[model samples]
Target: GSSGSSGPGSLSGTEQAEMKMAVISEHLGLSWAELARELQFSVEDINRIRVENPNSLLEQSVALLNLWVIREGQNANMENLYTALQSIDRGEIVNMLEGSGRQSRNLKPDR
Candidate 1:
């Protein structure tokens, strides 16, 4: 696996995936900060998961699913995209974020 320091003041695809996994785990009732710390990541990983581009296919798929869920009258209860991911995955919340319709690129496979 790629180390977290592979990128300068940022993360590569693998690092981003690791970070996203941590955030997703946290979103699913796992320890948010603890997991990030354990993975040698940071709380900022949560923010990165929301801001990074070229996201993994899994993340992109989840974003689409979230949008679908929100269209059905569900409420997105997060203060930001980071928290929104958590609420959507864990709290069973739904939303399309503040601005999410400007891009559409499938995530390239890591292999």
Candidate 2:
């Protein structure tokens, strides 16, 4: 029972999932397939998503991550998600993700 900080931040069960999904949506301008690969999805899985005739990058990104979220199940922790994007060297995506959230909605002047 040594795990500390079981407050709002530890609501990893829910909030982190939202933050992860938000970043995937807002910032995943590229590397949808690569991230899926890192998540250990099979080639057919990727191709199947392609077969869905995704509407666009935004659609693909949303669909692809939704598939990923279902596939990874409880294993889809934020760190795993972060590392997967990092796997593709999409640090810009990583930055937006690491950029806090819900709270970091401070998308305003820092002055």
Candidate 3:
């Protein structure tokens, strides 16, 4: 048998999960509380899961953060363009207004 001795330094499943969550949270610029908020989980629910089902929570949070990161990266340019167009159309851009004080013809996408 090639079974290795269990060492005290080895992480348990729960500790491994906690470490994973910490890494994901740091990468995403979110604390556990913020992650919970972004995922629409109440504080109470998160606390309950932390106490009873931390591994599940960690896995779910990782998946959510991955999806969020992908979506953000993919749409960042489009979102910026949309925001710029919105400002232009709303008369928020000075000296470069859209339309004739109503809508910006230049900003409109071609039919």
Candidate 4:
């Protein structure tokens, strides 16, 4: 099988999912529901997500970020998420993203 390897612009389905899980696993903490607010969920939407599984931070955050991914759709990138998490609304989520990321800063010329 040729199993073609496409160039940049899109992640494989697995890569996409794995990255999201990466953030949740690594940086996620209590009260991540606030992340929902930062990611653009409105008051009612955040509440609905909580009602779905208030018992687990993992579950709640998943729902929150899931809605975000959908809203962000194909046009968004770590840029938005960078500031979003960085703000924490105040955690600097993108600091982690900036250091090591989706092949970031390969063209180094930080002068």
Candidate 5:
């Protein structure tokens, strides 16, 4: 039932989640009040976006970009890029790099 509830128009049933994330992001200015307004996001939406883009906000706060290291495939637009990275960690990155490297090495040299 919980898994089935991920449809449109449903906030995830977690306590103080949306509020807590908003306070943290607001304090950090990662989701600034004005920017959130311009983006058409309520505080709740801000929390949702944070859940969806935790790494993005983390990188934004620290001024670093690790998406390229985490994501796979040739064409990952912004949305998919974030999702891809969300599923990856250090071990996954090492495996992916080694595997892709091996595949590249195995390919015949271009004439």
Candidate 6:
């Protein structure tokens, strides 16, 4: 019931759940692709389900946040984890990861 109302009777229960899921996903630095992996569904499937059953989406979003909290507890270096999360929030980590992967690849094949 913590899901906030958009306005005075502006949204149905399903719509409220959907909005909550969107907010949680953005806060956790998760794209639909990432959330789908955690929820064991494809992004397409998630969209379909979100329309069909917003409550389920809300449950999955809560589960995702719980998993993140557990992972943070498992890490000894909280500062590093905080920094990484900030990078993710700023959308820089994806570019950094892509660049690192490209740098590791061999552009020229060995004869």
lDDT of each: 0.40, 0.71, 0.44, 0.64, 0.37, 0.45
1-111 per-residue lDDT for model 2 (tens digits): 886664654424567667768667666644887877777889888888777846666666777878866776756566777778887887677686566455545567875
- The weakest ten consecutive residues by lDDT in model 5 span 61-70
> Which of 1 and 4 is ahead in TM-score?
4
Runs in model 4 lying further than 4 Å from the true structure: 1-5, 11-17, 89-93, 96-111
Between 2 and 5, whose lDDT is larger?
2
Assess candidate 5 and give its lDDT: 0.37
Clashing pairs in 3: 98-104, 99-103, 99-104
Give a tens-digit lDDT track for model 4, residues 1-111.
976777566632567546754675356555466666777678889888778867876777666666777887887665566566656653455554446545555766677
Q: Candidate 5, residues 1-111: lDDT per residue as tens digits? A: 446644364332245433433333333334332334343336675555456567656433222122221232334233332333334322332233324353434557677
The alpha-carbon deviation from the true structure for residue 17 of candidate 1, after best TM-score superposition, in angstroms, is 1.7
- Give the best candidate by TM-score: 2
lDDT of 6 by residue, 26-63 (tens): 45433433544543446665555456545654555455
Question: By summed lDDT, which 10 consecutive residues of candidate 2 come out lowest?
Answer: 5-14
6-107 per-residue lDDT for model 1 (tens digits): 445332236544454344443444333332333344546544544542355346334432442354333422233355445334333222222345667878
Q: Which pairs of residues have clashing backbones in candidate 5?
A: none
| Candidate 3 per-residue lDDT over residues 1-111, each given as its tens digit | 897776644432356445543454444332444544544546666565456545555554455444444555644332242243344242232124222555545756777
Quote the lDDT for 90 in model 6.
34
Q: Which of 1 and 2 is the better model by lDDT?
A: 2
Candidate 4, 52: how far from true, in Å? Answer: 0.4
Q: Please give me the total number of clashing residue pairs in predicted model 3.
A: 3
- On TM-score, the stronger of 1 and 3 is 3
RMSD of every prediction: 18.6, 7.8, 19.2, 6.4, 14.3, 16.2
Worst 10 residues of 6 by lDDT: 90-99
Q: Against the hidden reference, what TM-scores do the models get?
A: 0.21, 0.67, 0.24, 0.65, 0.21, 0.26
